[PDB]
């Protein structure tokens, strides 16, 4: 009869016929990931093509129902999600060109091998070898050689491809009634139709700048301290008034600063909180790691893992004969099937990763009651944030003592808290200006503010202004330095890490306030608190049914992303950095004073 009833029946038919197909596609992808064989690749490709064609046909059927005659929020949300053209609005030749460009960028990034000129008999790939060199070397010219050679080869291959990519994506986005591709990415946080809780695409950039203005003093103090320590490590390269050299940040691109913890440790003489040896001595299997994680999740009141999870997951490396992807991934295959694919080692990092992926599994399980097309996070930030809060809680010394992995006579003084907070700042705080600068540069490229001949001159200018990192040698327009990273080269949003980082500490403050913790925020553990788990599960059960602003009101009591929990988390470290920076000069100069 009415349009709304027609849409409701169509959505029921869609969820029914898209659930089995999604389960088949996900199962084919799982069989490829746990068993890399050519028939599994063919089955994955066939299932993906069927899934994409079915989604195209269902979107084509979905567009015939106008949006403004539907008043139910969930039905309107599913119809809005389904009616997106994607690449379908673009012409078939340009769509095929875009797909070919994405596939060839994937092959170039995955199979990119670079080694030193005059010694070409064997070369090293980035993931097996260059990562270890970037993370562990102390030699200036070796890191400079690796960085410049990899950006030379990758940028010179990818620059025309990226020039075509930006034009095709902008054409597709303007064909979809968006200003640019950046507006398309910012449309994930767009809330329309809810009184008071509406969020605009234009408000996101303003909120990011408003939060970053408060991020800036803490990052300036941290950058000054890291600059002083790298000046101690490398005597003549680093200037007191200038930016840091690009190849010395501990990673290939500057994504994380966590590989500089050894060089920038405040108190090396004091011990660490490493619990690896205790698990080796007590012979802790990966199964025991996942059982302890399950014990943590039942302690807070969340549901425990299904029988199918324990039966069907691969929690150990299979062997030489069978090949599997080493990256830890939680899979929501559909129809209540939840699995974790991780090559778990006996390390602290794998234990925290196990907690993070089981948090992903808990988030996936929570919205199982929801309709199929609403089975996602409210935004891209929440999905990662609910795993990062488990990563925060599991890493605390109180959690390690509670589960028996740490000695009960370990002395928790201020120095260990300072160095642990500094390590967490290098991992978490250090990625924020890089993420903000990269996303703002990509938004300005898509918007047309920066012409193609001036992409890099502005970019380094942004990096000096925001990240405080100077180029070793000037780069011309033949280079494509951003596209050497995995996410940007393979069409992935990058603001999810910034939103995840702020939501992580907002959720941490909310759960610690729920758990009635009376000390520092970084000393807080969310185990044994039923009310904290209930407050988490209230947001977790909603999925994508409700706006992210309303979910944030449900958890933290605020209608917008906030920067104060991050500053509260690192406040002892902030005071310590302010004390340590009396002699040194806070802030940097954008000039070429160290080296260019």
């Amino acid at each position: 009869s009415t349009i709304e009833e027609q849409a409701k029946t169509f959505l029921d038919k869609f969820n029914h016929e898209a659930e089995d197909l999604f389960y088949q596609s996900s199962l084919a992808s799982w069989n490829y990931n746990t068993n890399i064989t050519e028939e599994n690749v063919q089955n994955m490709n066939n299932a993906g093509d069927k899934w994409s064609a079915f989604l195209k046909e269902q979107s084509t059927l979905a567009q015939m129902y106008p949006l403004q005659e539907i008043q139910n929020l969930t039905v309107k949300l599913q119809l809005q999600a389904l009616q997106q053209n994607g690449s379908s609005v673009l012409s078939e030749d340009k769509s095929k060109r875009l797909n070919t460009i994405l596939n060839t960028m994937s092959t170039i990034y995955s199979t990119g091998k670079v080694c030193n000129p005059d010694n070409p008999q064997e070369c090293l790939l980035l993931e097996p070898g260059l990562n270890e060199i970037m993370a562990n070397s102390l030699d200036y010219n070796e890191r400079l050689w690796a960085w410049e050679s990899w950006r030379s080869e990758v940028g010179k291959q990818l620059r025309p491809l990226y020039e075509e990519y930006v034009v095709l994506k902008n054409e597709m986005a303007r064909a979809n009634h968006y200003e640019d591709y950046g507006d398309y990415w910012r449309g994930d946080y767009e809330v329309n139709g809810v009184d008071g809780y509406d969020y605009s695409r234009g408000q996101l950039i303003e909120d990011v700048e408003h939060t970053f203005e408060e991020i800036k003093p803490l990052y300036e103090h941290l950058h000054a301290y890291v600059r002083a320590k790298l000046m101690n490590a490398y005597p003549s390269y680093i200037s007191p008034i200038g930016c840091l050299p690009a190849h010395l940040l501990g990673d290939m691109w500057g994504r994380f600063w966590t590989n500089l913890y050894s060089l920038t440790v405040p108190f090396g003489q004091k011990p660490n909180i490493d619990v690896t040896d205790a698990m080796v001595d007590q012979a802790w299997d990966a199964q025991r790691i996942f059982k302890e994680a399950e014990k943590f999740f039942v302690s807070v009141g969340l549901p425990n893992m299904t029988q199918g999870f324990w039966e069907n997951s691969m929690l150990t490396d299979p062997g030489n004969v069978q090949k599997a992807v080493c990256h830890p991934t939680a899979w929501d295959l559909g129809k209540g099937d939840f699995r974790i694919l991780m090559c778990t080692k006996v390390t602290m990092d794998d234990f925290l990763t196990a907690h993070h992926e089981m948090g992903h599994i808990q988030y996936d399980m929570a919205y199982a009651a929801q309709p199929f097309l609403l089975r996602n996070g409210a935004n891209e930030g929440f999905h990662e944030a609910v795993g990062e809060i488990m990563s925060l809680s599991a890493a605390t010394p109180k959690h390690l003592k509670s589960i028996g992995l740490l000695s009960p006579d370990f002395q928790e003084d201020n120095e260990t808290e300072i160095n642990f907070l500094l390590k967490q700042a290098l991992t978490i705080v250090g990625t924020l200006p890089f993420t903000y600068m990269l996303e703002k540069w990509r938004w300005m490229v898509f918007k047309g503010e920066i012409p193609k001949d001036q992409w890099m001159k502005k970019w380094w200018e942004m990096k000096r202004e925001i990240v405080g990192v100077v180029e070793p040698v000037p780069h011309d327009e033949t280079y494509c330095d951003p596209a050497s990273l995995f996410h940007v080269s393979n069409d992935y949003s990058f603001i999810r890490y910034y939103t995840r980082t702020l939501y992580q500490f907002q959720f941490q403050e909310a759960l610690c306030q729920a758990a009635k913790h009376e000390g520092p925020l970084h000393k807080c553990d969310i185990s044994n608190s039923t009310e904290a788990g209930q407050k988490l599960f209230n947001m977790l059960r909603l999925g994508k049914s409700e706006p992210w602003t309303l979910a944030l009101e449900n958890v933290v009591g605020a209608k917008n992303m906030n920067v104060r929990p991050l500053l509260n988390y690192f406040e002892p470290l902030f005071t310590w950095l302010k004390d340590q920076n009396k002699n040194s000069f806070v802030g940097w100069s954008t000039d070429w004073s160290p080296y260019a």
Partner: protein, 99 residues
């Protein structure tokens, strides 16, 4: 995948108690006539169940048997098993033989 189990997904009105609907006529959700072909706004009401052994417990197949007991004015003939106490002789006992 076991697709040998179909359910009715759409009907204009709810079923009466103890009713079986095995009709395979196209459901009309819109004003337009279906004309017997499954196109737009017209769906086939019977849909198959996807049953895999790796599914969760909320999606695994469950066999359901419902027993309906009714009393009508006719003499009741489906009786339960009548437990019999061992026979004791030569003593003054309370006997109940076939009612």
């Amino acid at each position: 995948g076991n697709y040998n189990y179909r359910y009715r997904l759409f009907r204009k009105s709810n079923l009466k108690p103890f009713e079986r609907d095995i009709s395979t006529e196209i459901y009309q959700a819109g004003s337009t006539p279906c004309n017997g072909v499954e196109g737009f706004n017209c769906y086939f009401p019977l849909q198959s169940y996807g049953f895999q052994p790796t599914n969760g417990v909320g999606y695994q197949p469950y066999r359901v048997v419902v027993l309906s007991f009714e009393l009508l004015h006719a003499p009741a003939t489906v009786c339960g098993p009548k437990k019999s106490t061992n026979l004791v002789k030569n003593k003054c006992v309370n006997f109940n033989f076939n009612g």
